[PDB]
Design an enzyme around this catalytic site. Structure first.
Site: not given
Length: 303
Positions: A10, A182
């Site tokens: 995406s 992260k």
């Protein structure tokens, strides 16, 4: 000069739309001729911003044809990165640069080793985007992307082209420290959300489990030379929980949709890295074992 886009992620379509609409040369690299035929019937790439859909007729092609690739954006799942980059390795020009938009760690180093004569830059993004059809993407939420290269720390000159296209970015001289921040954040939240079948706000009801995980994850960050990340890891996990309390994690959505997770580059990569450092991580080990058993029980891969 040309931005070649590879992968069905995406984020790749969101980048391709903003790069192409800003006047920069962009070329989509689709999977096969059948996918190219359906893209041409659709007329281009559809981006949805606040309910408004726009059609961006970006040029597209297949990996076999086209011009030499000098700049390639790889936007796919981590378990597909090596196979995707190898499909266009015959078109890399030697001066080629790769921007790897994969989650976690592991796939980046595998691609970098498979393509030695190319420069592979690492990327970590917080932009939200999801697919609503074959060539339709929804801009779900604005974010920021960190770029860096552990082998060559100097920033490229084309970073200003990203500013022209409105792509928020920052060049980091230690991109591995960003990706580890992260990843440790993912290991502390996503595995428990799948095992407990709850939104991220539901992890407030398991405070000691969160603290023990960040404890071992903090030792893993300390042993890897990331002291600042290890000290603030616990409060960083607490902040993300409150900010995304009503959300289902990305790994929770993968499992409920019956798809493969990126566990081999998240919790699986962390326990792998702890073993190489001789650092015992038992709580993460049992958490990894329970998550793999959870995946196999539903016919999903455990890697």
């Amino acid at each position: 000069m040309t931005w070649h886009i590879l992968g069905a992620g995406s984020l790749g379509s969101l980048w391709a739309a903003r790069l192409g609409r800003a006047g920069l040369p962009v070329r989509l690299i689709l999977r096969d001729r059948q996918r190219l035929r359906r893209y041409q019937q659709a007329g281009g790439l559809s981006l949805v911003e606040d309910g408004q859909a726009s059609l961006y007729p970006i040029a597209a092609e297949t990996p076999d044809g086209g011009q030499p690739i000098q700049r390639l954006l790889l936007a796919c799942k981590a378990y597909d990165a090596e196979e995707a980059a190898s499909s266009v390795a015959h078109r890399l020009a030697g001066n080629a640069e790769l921007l790897l938009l994969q989650n976690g760690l592991g796939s980046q180093q595998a691609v970098a080793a498979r393509l030695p004569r190319s420069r592979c830059l690492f990327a970590s993004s917080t932009e939200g985007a999801f697919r609503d059809g074959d060539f339709r993407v929804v801009f779900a939420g604005r974010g920021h992307t960190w770029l860096g290269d552990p082998r060559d720390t100097n920033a490229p000159a084309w970073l200003t082209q990203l500013s022209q296209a409105g792509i928020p970015h920052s060049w980091s001289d230690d991109i591995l420290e960003r990706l580890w921040r992260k990843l440790a954040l993912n290991c502390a939240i996503n595995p428990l959300t799948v095992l407990h079948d709850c939104r991220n706000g539901g992890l407030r009801q398991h405070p000691e489990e969160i603290a023990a995980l960040c404890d071992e994850l903090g030792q893993l960050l300390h042993a890897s030379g990331y002291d600042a990340a290890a000290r603030s890891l616990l409060e960083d996990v607490r902040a993300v929980i409150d900010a995304t309390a009503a959300n289902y994690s990305s790994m929770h959505q993968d499992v409920t949709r019956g798809r493969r997770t990126e566990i081999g580059y998240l919790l699986g990569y962390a326990c792998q890295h702890g073993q190489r450092l001789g650092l015992p991580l038992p709580r993460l080990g049992t958490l990894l074992a329970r998550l793999q058993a959870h995946l196999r029980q539903r016919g999903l891969p455990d890697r």
